[PDB]
Amino acid sequence: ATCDDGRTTANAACCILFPILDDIQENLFDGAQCGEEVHESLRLTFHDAIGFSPTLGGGGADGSIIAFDTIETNFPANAGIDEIVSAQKPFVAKHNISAGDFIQFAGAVGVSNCPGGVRIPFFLGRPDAVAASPDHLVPEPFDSVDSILARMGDAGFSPVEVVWLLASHSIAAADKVDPSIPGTPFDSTPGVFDSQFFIETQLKGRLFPGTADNKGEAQSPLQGEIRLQSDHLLARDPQTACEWQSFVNNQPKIQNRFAATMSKMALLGQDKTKLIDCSDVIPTPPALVGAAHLPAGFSLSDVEQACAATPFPALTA
Ligand code: HEM
Ligand SMILES: [Ca+2]
Ligand SMILES: [Ca+2]
């Protein structure tokens, strides 16, 4: 189909997305940058979608975190999410897509601005949310591996798929974990969707980048980096460690797994056969240019190798 401005998409119902695309690139993502707003919108896709529990309810990826923000932003795990909820809500009011569609569309458009990134499959037509998420469904950085895996498992994600989704932390920072140092990233390249997160989490903890007593925070291997206790443990746990290491210097696998598992997450609570495929509306991400590396001056002796099956790859630094 050819839309009114002459841009093309496989399914005509998708044409309504193009003015929305233009609006968010300019006015949500500050001229299509891979910065804070993109990172925040990617975090939002998960805090919306993970509100899904067979036994308790919640409609998963349904826009409930905006529609019922009064409720959901009261949950402690949603700390700091109010900012991006407030930024996104006028876009939803202005345009004519559901909040659930908008959150996933904005997260996919956002990721597409990041070098190394992917086009996450995107489906149009989610109905408005009809219920708030139950409380206590969002993993916390101070939860054990067992508890995180059980929560993620309850929502339909195997332990490997939890590792796959956590590629998100390659383009990510913390403001609330240590409020003395807001915007400290999880990896050395928060504007690049790459394997640095999986490399650098495997390093020995050395210091705290701000204060030393924060709940959910592990020692970081670098002054300019923050480490979550959850990432620290998952990189090291027998359940997830070999999969975590499998991503190191393996950008093709990161791309494939992250796109597929993000699509599954975007569709929690939904039925893709009732929706319209609009994946071709997502912009083409830039590619990587620079090779995966240990931080300069670090070596293999700094890595806490946790995969018995396979030695940590030999990377230069
Ligand atoms: C599975 C267990 C997870 C835990 C314990 C966890 C924990 C966290 C924490 C503590 C922060 C920092 C919040 C702050 O202090 O500002 C964060 C940020 C972030 N999270 Fe995760 N997360 C998990 C999974 C995910 C998943 C599955 C996604 C996929 C979309 C994701 C995407 C992000 C992104 C992109 C940020 C950066 C936000 C920003 O820079 O504005 N996380 N997460
Ligand atoms: Ca939801
Ligand atoms: Ca990165």
PDB file of N, CA, C and O in Angstrom, residues 137-181:
ATOM      1  N   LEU A 137       4.219  -7.564  40.482  1.00  0.00           N
ATOM      2  CA  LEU A 137       4.495  -8.397  39.302  1.00  0.00           C
ATOM      3  C   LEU A 137       5.763  -7.989  38.545  1.00  0.00           C
ATOM      4  O   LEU A 137       6.144  -8.628  37.540  1.00  0.00           O
ATOM      5  N   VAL A 138       6.425  -6.944  39.021  1.00  0.00           N
ATOM      6  CA  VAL A 138       7.620  -6.396  38.355  1.00  0.00           C
ATOM      7  C   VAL A 138       8.886  -6.771  39.154  1.00  0.00           C
ATOM      8  O   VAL A 138       8.993  -6.448  40.351  1.00  0.00           O
ATOM      9  N   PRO A 139       9.827  -7.484  38.503  1.00  0.00           N
ATOM     10  CA  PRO A 139      11.097  -7.853  39.126  1.00  0.00           C
ATOM     11  C   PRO A 139      11.874  -6.646  39.616  1.00  0.00           C
ATOM     12  O   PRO A 139      11.801  -5.554  39.056  1.00  0.00           O
ATOM     13  N   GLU A 140      12.617  -6.874  40.679  1.00  0.00           N
ATOM     14  CA  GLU A 140      13.321  -5.829  41.340  1.00  0.00           C
ATOM     15  C   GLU A 140      14.822  -6.196  41.371  1.00  0.00           C
ATOM     16  O   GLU A 140      15.147  -7.383  41.334  1.00  0.00           O
ATOM     17  N   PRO A 141      15.745  -5.182  41.366  1.00  0.00           N
ATOM     18  CA  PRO A 141      17.185  -5.543  41.297  1.00  0.00           C
ATOM     19  C   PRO A 141      17.709  -6.228  42.553  1.00  0.00           C
ATOM     20  O   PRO A 141      18.817  -6.732  42.540  1.00  0.00           O
ATOM     21  N   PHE A 142      16.906  -6.249  43.619  1.00  0.00           N
ATOM     22  CA  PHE A 142      17.301  -6.902  44.843  1.00  0.00           C
ATOM     23  C   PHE A 142      16.583  -8.257  44.992  1.00  0.00           C
ATOM     24  O   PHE A 142      16.699  -8.895  46.015  1.00  0.00           O
ATOM     25  N   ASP A 143      15.886  -8.703  43.947  1.00  0.00           N
ATOM     26  CA  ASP A 143      15.278 -10.059  43.990  1.00  0.00           C
ATOM     27  C   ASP A 143      16.326 -11.131  43.647  1.00  0.00           C
ATOM     28  O   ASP A 143      17.250 -10.885  42.850  1.00  0.00           O
ATOM     29  N   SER A 144      16.174 -12.320  44.226  1.00  0.00           N
ATOM     30  CA  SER A 144      17.082 -13.427  43.926  1.00  0.00           C
ATOM     31  C   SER A 144      16.899 -13.875  42.474  1.00  0.00           C
ATOM     32  O   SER A 144      15.873 -13.596  41.864  1.00  0.00           O
ATOM     33  N   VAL A 145      17.878 -14.587  41.926  1.00  0.00           N
ATOM     34  CA  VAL A 145      17.700 -15.238  40.612  1.00  0.00           C
ATOM     35  C   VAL A 145      16.429 -16.117  40.587  1.00  0.00           C
ATOM     36  O   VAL A 145      15.617 -16.002  39.669  1.00  0.00           O
ATOM     37  N   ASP A 146      16.268 -16.970  41.592  1.00  0.00           N
ATOM     38  CA  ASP A 146      15.093 -17.869  41.663  1.00  0.00           C
ATOM     39  C   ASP A 146      13.769 -17.101  41.572  1.00  0.00           C
ATOM     40  O   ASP A 146      12.862 -17.488  40.843  1.00  0.00           O
ATOM     41  N   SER A 147      13.671 -16.006  42.321  1.00  0.00           N
ATOM     42  CA  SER A 147      12.478 -15.195  42.296  1.00  0.00           C
ATOM     43  C   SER A 147      12.235 -14.493  40.942  1.00  0.00           C
ATOM     44  O   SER A 147      11.096 -14.452  40.450  1.00  0.00           O
ATOM     45  N   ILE A 148      13.295 -13.951  40.348  1.00  0.00           N
ATOM     46  CA  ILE A 148      13.199 -13.342  39.020  1.00  0.00           C
ATOM     47  C   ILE A 148      12.786 -14.362  37.976  1.00  0.00           C
ATOM     48  O   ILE A 148      11.864 -14.125  37.161  1.00  0.00           O
ATOM     49  N   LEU A 149      13.433 -15.520  38.009  1.00  0.00           N
ATOM     50  CA  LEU A 149      13.124 -16.556  37.004  1.00  0.00           C
ATOM     51  C   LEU A 149      11.692 -17.067  37.159  1.00  0.00           C
ATOM     52  O   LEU A 149      11.025 -17.397  36.168  1.00  0.00           O
ATOM     53  N   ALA A 150      11.230 -17.135  38.403  1.00  0.00           N
ATOM     54  CA  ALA A 150       9.879 -17.634  38.689  1.00  0.00           C
ATOM     55  C   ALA A 150       8.840 -16.635  38.195  1.00  0.00           C
ATOM     56  O   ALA A 150       7.854 -17.025  37.569  1.00  0.00           O
ATOM     57  N   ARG A 151       9.050 -15.343  38.477  1.00  0.00           N
ATOM     58  CA  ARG A 151       8.193 -14.299  37.947  1.00  0.00           C
ATOM     59  C   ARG A 151       8.169 -14.295  36.426  1.00  0.00           C
ATOM     60  O   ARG A 151       7.093 -14.315  35.809  1.00  0.00           O
ATOM     61  N   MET A 152       9.341 -14.202  35.812  1.00  0.00           N
ATOM     62  CA  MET A 152       9.432 -14.199  34.357  1.00  0.00           C
ATOM     63  C   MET A 152       8.825 -15.466  33.758  1.00  0.00           C
ATOM     64  O   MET A 152       8.119 -15.397  32.754  1.00  0.00           O
ATOM     65  N   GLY A 153       9.110 -16.622  34.370  1.00  0.00           N
ATOM     66  CA  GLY A 153       8.509 -17.899  33.985  1.00  0.00           C
ATOM     67  C   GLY A 153       6.990 -17.924  34.052  1.00  0.00           C
ATOM     68  O   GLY A 153       6.324 -18.474  33.168  1.00  0.00           O
ATOM     69  N   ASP A 154       6.436 -17.338  35.117  1.00  0.00           N
ATOM     70  CA  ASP A 154       4.993 -17.256  35.291  1.00  0.00           C
ATOM     71  C   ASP A 154       4.375 -16.461  34.103  1.00  0.00           C
ATOM     72  O   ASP A 154       3.268 -16.791  33.661  1.00  0.00           O
ATOM     73  N   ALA A 155       5.087 -15.438  33.607  1.00  0.00           N
ATOM     74  CA  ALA A 155       4.609 -14.621  32.462  1.00  0.00           C
ATOM     75  C   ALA A 155       4.889 -15.281  31.099  1.00  0.00           C
ATOM     76  O   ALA A 155       4.399 -14.796  30.070  1.00  0.00           O
ATOM     77  N   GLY A 156       5.646 -16.376  31.112  1.00  0.00           N
ATOM     78  CA  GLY A 156       5.855 -17.210  29.924  1.00  0.00           C
ATOM     79  C   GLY A 156       7.284 -17.217  29.382  1.00  0.00           C
ATOM     80  O   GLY A 156       7.519 -17.755  28.308  1.00  0.00           O
ATOM     81  N   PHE A 157       8.241 -16.657  30.126  1.00  0.00           N
ATOM     82  CA  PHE A 157       9.662 -16.610  29.688  1.00  0.00           C
ATOM     83  C   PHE A 157      10.564 -17.631  30.378  1.00  0.00           C
ATOM     84  O   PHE A 157      10.695 -17.648  31.596  1.00  0.00           O
ATOM     85  N   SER A 158      11.196 -18.470  29.567  1.00  0.00           N
ATOM     86  CA  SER A 158      12.217 -19.396  30.046  1.00  0.00           C
ATOM     87  C   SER A 158      13.405 -18.575  30.550  1.00  0.00           C
ATOM     88  O   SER A 158      13.494 -17.368  30.264  1.00  0.00           O
ATOM     89  N   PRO A 159      14.277 -19.195  31.381  1.00  0.00           N
ATOM     90  CA  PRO A 159      15.512 -18.545  31.824  1.00  0.00           C
ATOM     91  C   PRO A 159      16.378 -17.979  30.685  1.00  0.00           C
ATOM     92  O   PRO A 159      16.903 -16.871  30.832  1.00  0.00           O
ATOM     93  N   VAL A 160      16.515 -18.688  29.565  1.00  0.00           N
ATOM     94  CA  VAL A 160      17.284 -18.118  28.443  1.00  0.00           C
ATOM     95  C   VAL A 160      16.617 -16.863  27.884  1.00  0.00           C
ATOM     96  O   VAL A 160      17.292 -15.927  27.538  1.00  0.00           O
ATOM     97  N   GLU A 161      15.280 -16.838  27.838  1.00  0.00           N
ATOM     98  CA  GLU A 161      14.557 -15.701  27.287  1.00  0.00           C
ATOM     99  C   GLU A 161      14.650 -14.474  28.166  1.00  0.00           C
ATOM    100  O   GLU A 161      14.573 -13.356  27.646  1.00  0.00           O
ATOM    101  N   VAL A 162      14.824 -14.691  29.475  1.00  0.00           N
ATOM    102  CA  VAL A 162      15.128 -13.607  30.432  1.00  0.00           C
ATOM    103  C   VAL A 162      16.488 -12.983  30.104  1.00  0.00           C
ATOM    104  O   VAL A 162      16.626 -11.765  30.026  1.00  0.00           O
ATOM    105  N   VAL A 163      17.476 -13.825  29.858  1.00  0.00           N
ATOM    106  CA  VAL A 163      18.797 -13.324  29.394  1.00  0.00           C
ATOM    107  C   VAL A 163      18.665 -12.535  28.066  1.00  0.00           C
ATOM    108  O   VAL A 163      19.240 -11.458  27.916  1.00  0.00           O
ATOM    109  N   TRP A 164      17.909 -13.084  27.108  1.00  0.00           N
ATOM    110  CA  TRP A 164      17.663 -12.408  25.839  1.00  0.00           C
ATOM    111  C   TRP A 164      17.074 -11.011  25.985  1.00  0.00           C
ATOM    112  O   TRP A 164      17.579 -10.045  25.365  1.00  0.00           O
ATOM    113  N   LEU A 165      16.027 -10.899  26.807  1.00  0.00           N
ATOM    114  CA  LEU A 165      15.385  -9.610  27.077  1.00  0.00           C
ATOM    115  C   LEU A 165      16.287  -8.565  27.740  1.00  0.00           C
ATOM    116  O   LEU A 165      16.139  -7.360  27.508  1.00  0.00           O
ATOM    117  N   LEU A 166      17.185  -9.053  28.596  1.00  0.00           N
ATOM    118  CA  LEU A 166      18.132  -8.220  29.296  1.00  0.00           C
ATOM    119  C   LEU A 166      19.221  -7.600  28.394  1.00  0.00           C
ATOM    120  O   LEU A 166      19.978  -6.777  28.861  1.00  0.00           O
ATOM    121  N   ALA A 167      19.273  -7.968  27.116  1.00  0.00           N
ATOM    122  CA  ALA A 167      20.037  -7.175  26.147  1.00  0.00           C
ATOM    123  C   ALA A 167      19.611  -5.706  26.175  1.00  0.00           C
ATOM    124  O   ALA A 167      20.392  -4.833  25.827  1.00  0.00           O
ATOM    125  N   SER A 168      18.376  -5.435  26.601  1.00  0.00           N
ATOM    126  CA  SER A 168      17.884  -4.049  26.842  1.00  0.00           C
ATOM    127  C   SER A 168      18.831  -3.207  27.736  1.00  0.00           C
ATOM    128  O   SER A 168      18.965  -1.979  27.594  1.00  0.00           O
ATOM    129  N   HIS A 169      19.500  -3.879  28.669  1.00  0.00           N
ATOM    130  CA  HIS A 169      20.390  -3.184  29.585  1.00  0.00           C
ATOM    131  C   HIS A 169      21.689  -2.691  28.917  1.00  0.00           C
ATOM    132  O   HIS A 169      22.448  -1.926  29.528  1.00  0.00           O
ATOM    133  N   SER A 170      21.926  -3.128  27.667  1.00  0.00           N
ATOM    134  CA  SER A 170      22.965  -2.551  26.807  1.00  0.00           C
ATOM    135  C   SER A 170      22.702  -1.060  26.452  1.00  0.00           C
ATOM    136  O   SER A 170      23.632  -0.343  26.079  1.00  0.00           O
ATOM    137  N   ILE A 171      21.469  -0.582  26.610  1.00  0.00           N
ATOM    138  CA  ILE A 171      21.102   0.832  26.247  1.00  0.00           C
ATOM    139  C   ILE A 171      20.272   1.388  27.394  1.00  0.00           C
ATOM    140  O   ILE A 171      19.055   1.589  27.271  1.00  0.00           O
ATOM    141  N   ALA A 172      20.919   1.576  28.542  1.00  0.00           N
ATOM    142  CA  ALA A 172      20.180   1.683  29.822  1.00  0.00           C
ATOM    143  C   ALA A 172      20.992   2.349  30.915  1.00  0.00           C
ATOM    144  O   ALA A 172      22.220   2.173  30.975  1.00  0.00           O
ATOM    145  N   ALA A 173      20.311   3.115  31.775  1.00  0.00           N
ATOM    146  CA  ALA A 173      20.946   3.754  32.930  1.00  0.00           C
ATOM    147  C   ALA A 173      20.022   3.678  34.123  1.00  0.00           C
ATOM    148  O   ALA A 173      18.842   3.376  33.960  1.00  0.00           O
ATOM    149  N   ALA A 174      20.553   3.959  35.318  1.00  0.00           N
ATOM    150  CA  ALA A 174      19.755   4.024  36.550  1.00  0.00           C
ATOM    151  C   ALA A 174      19.734   5.447  37.122  1.00  0.00           C
ATOM    152  O   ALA A 174      20.764   6.114  37.192  1.00  0.00           O
ATOM    153  N   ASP A 175      18.550   5.884  37.546  1.00  0.00           N
ATOM    154  CA  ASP A 175      18.356   7.152  38.272  1.00  0.00           C
ATOM    155  C   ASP A 175      17.979   6.938  39.731  1.00  0.00           C
ATOM    156  O   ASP A 175      18.272   7.794  40.565  1.00  0.00           O
ATOM    157  N   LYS A 176      17.294   5.826  40.027  1.00  0.00           N
ATOM    158  CA  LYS A 176      16.749   5.605  41.375  1.00  0.00           C
ATOM    159  C   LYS A 176      17.566   4.661  42.239  1.00  0.00           C
ATOM    160  O   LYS A 176      17.488   4.755  43.470  1.00  0.00           O
ATOM    161  N   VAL A 177      18.329   3.761  41.614  1.00  0.00           N
ATOM    162  CA  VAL A 177      19.149   2.791  42.379  1.00  0.00           C
ATOM    163  C   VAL A 177      20.112   3.535  43.307  1.00  0.00           C
ATOM    164  O   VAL A 177      20.194   3.245  44.519  1.00  0.00           O
ATOM    165  N   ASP A 178      20.817   4.525  42.747  1.00  0.00           N
ATOM    166  CA  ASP A 178      21.653   5.442  43.532  1.00  0.00           C
ATOM    167  C   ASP A 178      21.331   6.877  43.063  1.00  0.00           C
ATOM    168  O   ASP A 178      21.844   7.343  42.037  1.00  0.00           O
ATOM    169  N   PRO A 179      20.412   7.551  43.780  1.00  0.00           N
ATOM    170  CA  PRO A 179      19.989   8.906  43.373  1.00  0.00           C
ATOM    171  C   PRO A 179      21.057  10.002  43.462  1.00  0.00           C
ATOM    172  O   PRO A 179      20.819  11.109  42.985  1.00  0.00           O
ATOM    173  N   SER A 180      22.230   9.706  44.042  1.00  0.00           N
ATOM    174  CA  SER A 180      23.355  10.653  44.061  1.00  0.00           C
ATOM    175  C   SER A 180      24.024  10.710  42.685  1.00  0.00           C
ATOM    176  O   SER A 180      24.739  11.674  42.351  1.00  0.00           O
ATOM    177  N   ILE A 181      23.816   9.667  41.884  1.00  0.00           N
ATOM    178  CA  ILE A 181      24.484   9.585  40.576  1.00  0.00           C
ATOM    179  C   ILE A 181      23.499   9.246  39.444  1.00  0.00           C
ATOM    180  O   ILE A 181      23.699   8.270  38.725  1.00  0.00           O
TER     181      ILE A 181
END
